[PDB]
Design a protein around this ligand. Structure first.
Ligand code: PTR
Ligand code: PTR
Ligand code: MG
Length: 298
């Protein structure tokens, strides 16, 4: 099982080598659409692009490109859309995607400003009375309510297709203390947050895939999805030992490049899954422990 493997890798001090082996074995598929000259201003990073086979296509006749990938986990029966933090000119495309893909939740794992630089546009309204209208995609977005915790905030937003007047409730789960190329403060804080997303019903198969993003949509995003899928896998079978975490990560990498950006994020993923397995296997009390340990109260 992964716990024994975690021990071997830890004692050997080989997280860097294990992680590097994953980078070496990772899939390489073309990203020709992402690289078209007309799409230059739709990519936040030159080196992070969606593969053509798994990219999400916007349903507009103009230009259907958005730096977003559909991670379809067949065995686990869960899909996620991993995307970069929207740019000033792609906020309308972002919400168009949320609408068209029928997503119920948006998981944001970064902050708008990190390390003195703008890593993501302010794509949602910060005040109820100042709603946002994305003219290019004909969508209106209104902040309905906000529940601010110590290291994450949950928001209820109302997305409206101005063309048809149909409205939908979108839940925003914002993890505010996870530095890029870094790991969460503890497996507890992370699991507490993941469980809040799960409890909301945003990951349910009755909804479109949850949209997960960070700045690039691969590091922190990849860590979140890897832990969730691994937990879901062992949950379906109620068998912790049936999950090969490296293999699951490689499977995800068939859909988007660079998922999990550092060896420590991989190590953290193992920790999160191993700890989460306690809940999956019947000890529901650990959830309350995580809530305590996370110190979510201000
Ligand atoms: N390598 C580039 C792009 C990059 C940025 C962030 C990143 O992680 P995340 O997906 O967690 O935002 C991954 C890659 C950079 O370091 O700026
Ligand atoms: N951090 C990289 C993003 C990235 C990293 C790795 C990657 O694939 P691989 O790990 O196999 O090299 C793909 C994309 C960059 O922005 O330069
Ligand atoms: Mg106010």
């Amino acid at each position: 099982e992964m716990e024994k493997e975690f021990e071997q890798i830890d004692k050997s001090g080989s997280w860097a080598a294990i992680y590097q082996d994953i980078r070496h074995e990772a899939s390489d598929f073309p990203c020709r659409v992402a690289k078209l000259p007309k799409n230059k201003n739709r990519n936040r990073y030159r080196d992070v692009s969606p593969f053509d086979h798994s990219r999400i296509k916007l349903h507009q006749e103009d230009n259907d490109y958005i730096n977003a990938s559909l991670i379809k986990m067949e065995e686990a029966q869960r899909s996620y859309i991993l995307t970069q933090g929207p740019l000033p000119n792609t906020c309308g495309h972002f919400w168009e995607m949320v609408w068209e893909q029928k997503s119920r939740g948006v998981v944001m794992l970064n902050r708008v400003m990190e390390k003195g630089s703008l890593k993501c546009a302010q794509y949602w309204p910060q005040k109820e009375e100042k709603e946002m209208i994305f003219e290019d995609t004909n969508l209106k977005l209104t902040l309905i309510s906000e529940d601010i915790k110590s290291y994450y905030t949950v928001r209820q937003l109302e997305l409206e297709n101005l063309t048809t007047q149909e409205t939908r409730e979108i839940l925003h789960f914002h993890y505010t203390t996870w530095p890029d190329f870094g790991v969460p403060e503890s497996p507890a804080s992370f699991l507490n947050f993941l469980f809040k997303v799960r409890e909301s019903g945003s990951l349910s198969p009755e909804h479109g895939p949850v949209v997960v993003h960070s700045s690039a949509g691969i590091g922190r995003s990849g860590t979140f999805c890897l832990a969730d899928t691994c937990l879901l896998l062992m949950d379906k079978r109620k068998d912790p030992s049936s999950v090969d975490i490296k293999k699951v990560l490689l499977e995800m990498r068939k859909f988007r490049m660079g998922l999990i950006q550092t060896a420590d994020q991989l190590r953290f993923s193992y920790l999160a899954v191993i700890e989460g397995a306690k809940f999956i296997m019947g000890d529901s009390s650990v959830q309350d422990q995580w809530k305590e340990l996370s110190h979510e109260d201000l």
